[model samples]
Each structure stands twice: as structure tokens, then as C-alpha cells.
Target: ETTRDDLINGNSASCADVIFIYARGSTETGNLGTLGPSIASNLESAFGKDGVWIQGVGGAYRATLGDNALPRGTSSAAIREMLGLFQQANTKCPDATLIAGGYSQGAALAAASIEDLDSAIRDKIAGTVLFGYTKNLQNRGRIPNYPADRTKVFCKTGDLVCTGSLIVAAPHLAYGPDARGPAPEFLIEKVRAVRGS
Candidate 1:
């Protein structure tokens, strides 16, 4: 039910100190059960709702077999949506910090979008975070060309999606609890660095 006007007038368009772009995993929506929401919550805690602008990128939300399954085109669409958000944020809030992150299939979309961004837009980004990324998909799953110091890629020890190992799904879910403590702290440090630089 979200409208384009809603997106245009959302917090991302506000003059916040930072804008955080988050992409959710397959079949997930609105900031639930994803690293994006968790990071957003933590940022809100640290910087207040006004200081942080959070945008959740949307996509097909499907993963199972059938006509409704997640499509590559859906990811491409998400990339365009993300790019538009970045462009808008940069245009509207040039001084605000920019951070991008995602989980699972969404991570792939984020990666592709970040890679395709113009250097000017990418320069505005302070850092990136990724969880349960599918490393097997070379085109979209890998991290973008951001500096290593400005990015954090988290993959649990046995995460099949990131490691391309066994099919167990347990490791993928492990990120929430494991990252709940460190991810926000990592982002806070990165933001501080970005501001200082």
C-alpha cells in the first residue's frame, strides 16, 4: 500500500544526519525479521527517529516454486528502486551520511545496485553491511567495490547461502542474535568515521 508519494515524503527526504537504505530477504516485508530493521532500530536508539532516515527497498517477496517465485527481474527492479532512493537522498540531503545494507536475496540486489551507482553517489555512502549473502551468484551476491574498511559482511560459520556448503538453513538465522550486538556498533563507528573524514 506504500505510494510513491509516501516514499518521496518519507524520512529519507527529511534532513536527517544519516540515511540508511535496507533491503529485506525473500518473502519478507516492512522491516520485520531482517537485519535492516534491526539496524534501523539500533540507529533510532542511538540517534533518535529524526536523526536517522530508514528506507526498506521492496521486491517480489517470493522464493518458492510456481509462478510467484522470486525472479531475477524482481532483483533488477529492486536495484532501480534503490538507485532512485540514493539519487533522491543525495539530491535532497547532500550533507547527510549514507549507509546501505541487506540480507539474503536482498543482499544480492543491494550489491548490484551499489556497484552500478555513480561514483558521486557512492562517495556519499559511508559504509555497507550484508548478512547471509549468496556468494555463489557472482553478478549480484558479492560485495560492491566499497573500501574494505567501510564494509562489514557477516556470514555465520555454516551459512550455506554465503559459503555455498550444505543446505542447512540454521546458520542463516543465526545472524540476528549474533549481529544484534555488533552490527549497530559497527555502523555507529563507521558513521563516526565518515563524519570525521
Candidate 2:
């Protein structure tokens, strides 16, 4: 039984029908942090307690305020951690529809890691939901080759960080509650497409 603690730490399910690997925003104490918990919770509610698994990056990355111009040192570790979870889900849960998402720094981590994976692994990822995406400007507001149809990027109008600012404004923090519905519906829809059930 994956307990509530697994949401904050991390968990790799035995054989879940859906797996969501989520990364926390910078400086948040737990792995799932503020944004990821609600998103993951909705997935659980949609798929049933045992049908969905949530994996947080668990890298304990330093959430620095350095602007996007600076080297992304803190996110490097988290990107790698998230990739491993993605790989584990792909390898262990071949039948499961793999999903991913993140907030702020975590959003950058998800986009970078997915791009780095080989096509074989990347093909396993059905969708992604990112909030406060750091690379909104750098990657021309999209993950290089990840399908546009399978991604959701949420940025409130005033979120400076989403448009490449260093400041963490109120809009950035407000994404958690607002995203629960759309992001969950996105993942669930993608899973259905893949599972064909």
C-alpha cells in the first residue's frame, strides 16, 4: 500500500495503469511540494487509489532565484532524478500510460529530461502538464519535439517567471489550485487514448 507519505517522497508502483512523475517547484520542502499534490490527487481520484502512482523527483535540488540567463545548476540534478523515474515507469509499467508534469523549476526539469530521453523512452510518455514553465521563451514556448497535442502549459497572465523573469510572483504560487482540473483532465484523456478502454 503506497501511503500518503509516498506522495511527498516518491513511489514506483508494482503495475499501475497510470503513472505520473511530478517535480516540485524550487525551494519547496517536500518532493511533490505545493503544486504537484493537487494534480496527483486528482489523478488518483480519476483512476482509483491503486490504479495511479505518483513519483516526485526527490532530488532536494537547490531552488535558486538566479534568472534563466544563469546556468541551471540546481535543476540538473532534478532533471536526472525525474528521468530515472520516467525510465522506471516505462520499464516496469509497460502497460501503463506514462504522464509527467512540474511547477516552475520542476517544469523546466520535465521538459529538459523528456527531450533528453531516447525515442523509445519518449514514446512511452503520453502527456505532460507544466505550470510556470521556465523555458517558455527559450524553447519558443514549447518542448522542442514533444507533441503540442499532448502538453498543457499553464501560466497566469502576470506570472513573470513564466515569461522569463527571475521574480516569483503571487501568480506563480496560485497555479496549484487552479490547475487541478485541467491538468488532471488532460492526463486522463491521454491515458484513455493510449489504453483504448
Candidate 3:
């Protein structure tokens, strides 16, 4: 994996041919955390730096102790930040192959980011990738009406966080650099389908 945080904590501010908006997990020091940056580098390696634009979502939201702690059907700062990025991304680069992703708590944020987006924006999304996914545990499976084939979820083995057990196990914190757990490959393959190449 690359020893960099540009994609993790930094924002590209505009889309290139591809756009990846990333949200970091709870307690992660920056906007993009360890796992998300790994995937970002994977995409950068696959598509080249100029081929992808990376944006890290930042706001005053982190599951102090829980993602479920936030009641359902309410908005938070992270949600607003993530949604605003998507809205602007759609407006600025409607044709860019779009991806949204996060790790752990950020995974929940990423999923919620697009929850209420209009179909025009939703349909443009190439995929969503989640590491240490809590959506499944939260009873929020693959997005409703969104193509199942387009969404990728990865959980380190035995990570109870994936199953909603609410325990932080070793598996939950170990997604650092296993070549993105195939998320980058998924992104490339899906984008290839969209580009017909």
C-alpha cells in the first residue's frame, strides 16, 4: 500500500474521469481513515492520479461510541457533508464514473449519504464500497432499488461489527492494506462495464 494520506485526508475538489468520495470511520484522525486510504490508493494505481478525483468528507460527526447511537431518520454533520459533496459532484461532473465508500462508522455514513438522493444522481453512481460494514448489522442491506451487482461490502472475518454485535474485535481494525480487499478491482470492472471497454 502507498504511504500517503492525500486521498484519505485531502479533497481533490473536482472530478476527473472518476470520482471517489470517501468518509473516514469513527476516531480516525482524518477525513479518510486507514482502510479508506488503502482503497483510494488502489484506485489511483489502477486509474492513475489524473484519472481519479478523491474527496474526503469531514464534519463534526463520529459515533462517540456507536453508529446506532444516532437515532434513525435524523441527519448529522457528516451526513450533510457527504450529501453536499455528492450533490456538487453530480452538478460538476455528471458524467464522471462515481463511487462512494467508507469504513466502519464511515460506512454507515456513506450508505446514508446517498439514501435520499434523487434518481438522477443515484443512477450515475457506479458503486458503493464498504469496509467493516455496519449497514448489514444495522439491517440496512444493499440500497433499495440500487443494483446489487454494483455494491461491494467487505468485512474482515469474524468482525462482529459486521453482524451488529457492537464489539470492536481485531478483525474490525485490520483492514489496513490487503490490496483493498478487492474493492479497487470491483471499481475497475464496473467502470469498464459502464465505459464499454
In terms of TM-score, the best-performing candidate is 2
Q: What is the per-residue lDDT of model 3 for residues 48-69, given as tens digits with 9 covering 90 to 100?
A: 8977877777655543455545
Q: What is candidate 2's lDDT per residue for 1-197, written digit by digit as tens?
A: 11133333434445777778877777675667787778777888888878887777775455545523445513566667767777776667677778888788878878888888877878878999888887886777687679888888988889987777767788888885666688888888898888876
Q: Is 2 or 3 the stronger prediction by TM-score?
A: 2
TM-score of 1: 0.81
For model 3 the local lDDT of residue 58 reads 65
| Clash pairs for candidate 2 | none
TM value for model 2: 0.87
In model 1, the runs with Cα more than 4 Å from the true position are 1-7, 11-14, 31-33, 59-74, 136-142, 165-168
By lDDT, who's the top model here? 2
**Candidate order (lDDT):** 2, 3, 1
Worst 10 residues of 2 by lDDT: 1-10
C-alpha lDDT (0 to 100) for residue 47 of candidate 3: 82
Candidate 2 segments whose C-alpha is farther than 4 A from its true place: 1-14, 60-74
How high is the CA lDDT of each candidate model? Answer: 0.67, 0.74, 0.71
Model 2's lDDT to the true fold? 0.74
